[PDB]
Structure formats: structure tokens, C-alpha cells
Ligand SMILES: [Ca+2]
Ligand SMILES: [Ca+2]
């Protein structure tokens with residue numbers, strides 16, 4: 001499994017990015033989730049905000065629920081200097097302070113990486129179209145008649161509506177993989193194909 005470091009940040013809402021897997025990505029003002037497959041560790045900065053902790057905790061619960069006991073989750077404080085955390089991280093050193101991470105208020109306003117797209121072959125050809133971005137990605141945009149691709153800031157989901165066409169159902173995953181390339185995201189950005197009606201905890205977690 002490819003271990004990934006996730007960075008959660010904000011004041012009124014929380015956005016998540018994949019950041020380079022090193023202690024240099026950390027900062028004491030935010031919350032990070034180290035996803036090592038069977039081990040998942042939430043790291044709370046000494047100056048982490050309540051909401052950042054809450055949404056990281058929700059991500060852990062969703063990852064746990066979706067991996068069905070294969071993965072265990074654990075929270076550590078920055079002051080704990082958790083040794084398993086830094087071992088899985090692969091390095092250790094001084095942690096940048098909160099100010100070095102930038103303002104949470106600016107992040108709310110400037111950094112909204114979510115993207116929602118629709119894949120539809122209703123016209124007779126495949127059309128792959130951006131529908132909304134940032135905070136305007138709302139669950140009500142999903143339509144059982146088509147396929148939808150959601151980039152959360154940390155993962156790409158290909159959501160297959162129950163009434164998607166035969167072509168939409170077959171090509172859903174490949175359009176979502178192609179999005180990672182054309183959008184210039186990290187090559188190993190996780191991509192998952194999911195069905196309408198599934199638990200889809202991590203996908204559902206994005207909207208609350
Ligand atoms: Ca913060
Ligand atoms: Ca359709």
C-alpha cells in the first residue's frame with residue numbers, strides 16, 4: 001500500500017490535500033492524516049482548530065468503515081511525538097509553527113479543490129463535463145441517470161448512478177483515471193469506482 005499524508009485545514013469549512021510524505025509538510029496549526037493502509041493516524045497540531053480535528057476524525061471513521069476492520073485508526077497529539085507516526089512518515093525533525101501554515105480564514109476563501117464532473121452518453125457520444133467546484137459541490141447534484149466524478153482534494157470517485165447507461169457504467173472508471181492525468185494531479189492519486197446505494201463512507205463523508 002502507498003502511504004499518503006493528508007492535510008486538513010480551515011475555519012468555517014475544511015479542505016483536504018495530499019501533501020509530500022515528510023515531517024516538513026506538517027505544521028502545528030492544522031490536522032494531518034497519515035494513511036498507511038492498515039494503520040491510519042490522525043495527527044493533531046498543538047494549535048489545531050476544533051473543526052479541523054472534527055473532520056479529520058470523520059475521515060478516519062469513514063476510512064475504517066470502508067476497510068472493514070482491515071484498517072485501525074488512532075489519534076495522537078503533536079506533543080505526544082508518536083513514534084509509530086514518524087516511523088511511517090519516514091523522517092522526523094522540527095515542526096513548522098501555525099503561522100508557517102498560513103491563515104485558516106484565507107484557506108477557507110482561497111483553497112477549495114473539490115471538483116464534480118458528469119459523464120453522460122445521452123447525446124450518443126460521451127460528454128465529460130465539469131458541473132461545480134469548491135463549496136458548490138453539493139450532493140443534490142448527483143443524478144441516478146448518469147455517472148459522476150468527484151475529486152475531494154484527496155481522492156477521485158467514479159459514482160455510478162443506478163440508471164446509468166451501459167456505456168457510462170463501463171467507461172466510468174477510465175474517465176475518472178483520465179481526469180487525474182489531465183488535471184495534473186499526483187500520478188498515484190487514489191481512484192475508486194462506487195455504486196449508487198452503496199455505503200461509500202468516504203465519498204459520503206465529503207458532503208457532511
Ligand atoms: Ca488550523
Ligand atoms: Ca445516462
Ligand SMILES: [Ca+2]
Nearest residue numbers: 058205206208
Ligand atoms: Ca464529513
Ligand SMILES: [Cl-]
Nearest residue numbers: 103104105106
Ligand atoms: Cl486565521
